[PDB]
Design a protein around this ligand. Sequence first.
Ligand SMILES: CN(C)Cc1ccc(C(=O)Nc2cc(Cl)cc(C(=O)NC(C)(C)CO)c2)[nH]1
Ligand code: NA
Lengths: 38, 153
Amino acid sequence: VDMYIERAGDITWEKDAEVTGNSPRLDVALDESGDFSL
Amino acid sequence: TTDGVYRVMTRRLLGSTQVGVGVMQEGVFHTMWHVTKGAALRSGEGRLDPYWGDVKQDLVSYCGPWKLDAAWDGLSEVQLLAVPPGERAKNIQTLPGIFKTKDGDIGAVALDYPAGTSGSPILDKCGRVIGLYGNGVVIKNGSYVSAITQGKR
Ligand SMILES: CN(C)Cc1ccc(C(=O)Nc2cc(Cl)cc(C(=O)NC(C)(C)CO)c2)[nH]1
Ligand code: NA
């Protein structure tokens, strides 16, 4: 078995986390292979 | 098998390489199909076997059915709990955009991380997992926009 998992953290909301990224409204297609495109 | 966020690692390539990220909740490991392609996983001396998967949703669950059922409210800021290769887990807060599809609207997070970050969980203000980051599109800039990909429970 080639693949393995390592714990990286707890799943918690962090008050006063770094706030960034934009919020685009995009027109997309989802093909049978699970690829998104514009 | 403790609840939390996990790196998915392989020793097939050079050194130890991070292929992606997943979520352990209710004894089930959750990641994106393209991270593992449905392969078995090692956990200490334990082995995790795939239970459910779908290439089109790009999700897979190990040791049981998909458990994550919370949804984006369509209104509020969320946090990406990004786990980048070789770097600490880090909460990034953002307002999702939208993917408009012929079959309805999904949340979208516009944050640039390496491909090895696929499967990082997205959180609501109560800490609940509303989906996984790491399947999406490269836009004009050269930047990445991920679906908020949630399975069915
Ligand atoms: C799921 N299958 C069928 C489709 C597929 C192939 C690849 C993907 C996919 O979404 N890959 C991916 C995931 C992530 Cl988290 C980041 C980047 C990325 O290129 N990020 C940059 C900021 C540009 C830095 O390299 C790319 N989906
Ligand atoms: Na396989």
